[PDB]
Structure formats: structure tokens, C-alpha cells
């Protein structure tokens, strides 16, 4: 059935970066990037 897929990655600019307001964020929204 519909389940959550585990997506792995690495902190890379500009691939994966942390938002300025990630502290007040939750889950996947805590991230930003290509």
C-alpha cells in the first residue's frame, strides 16, 4: 500500500542546503536545494 519512501542524500551546496528558518520547520521542509 501507500507507504513513505526513504530518500537518502547529503548536505551539498547547492544540491542540499539548510533553510535560514529550518529551526522552526519540520520534516522534509527543513531542507532546500536542487
Amino acid at each position: 500500500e501507500n507507504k513513505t519512501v526513504v530518500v537518502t542524500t547529503i548536505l551539498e551546496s547547492p544540491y542540499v542546503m539548510m533553510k535560514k528558518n529550518h529551526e522552526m520547520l519540520e520534516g522534509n521542509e527543513r531542507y532546500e536545494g536542487y
Binding site: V5, V6, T8, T9, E12, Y15, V16
Partner: protein, 50 residues
């Protein structure tokens, strides 16, 4: 699944599967750079010495 700046190599293929590459690239060399400002009035008297 992995969605990240991951280099695809044969040995990595030998253990898991990969899609078609989306961004082609190559090895590059990074160094420091000298930044010489283009002078103004001094561009005139440049050649010899003051």
C-alpha cells in the same frame, strides 16, 4: 533510493542499480587567483618609476 550528487562508477554499478545520468561533468582543478586592480592616474606613469 538515493537522489544526491552521486558519481556513477562501475564498482558502484556492481552492487546496486542506477538510472540514466542527468548531468555530465568531469574532473576540475581549483586554485587561488591574484586580483590586480586596473589603476587610474597611475596607469599613466606606470612604466618607469616615480
Amino acid at each position: 533510493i538515493a537522489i544526491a550528487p552521486l558519481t556513477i562508477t562501475l564498482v558502484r554499478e556492481e552492487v546496486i542499480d542506477f538510472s540514466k545520468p542527468f548531468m555530465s561533468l568531469g574532473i576540475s582543478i581549483m586554485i587561488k587567483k591574484p586580483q590586480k586592480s586596473k589603476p587610474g592616474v597611475f596607469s599613466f606613469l606606470d612604466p618607469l618609476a616615480y
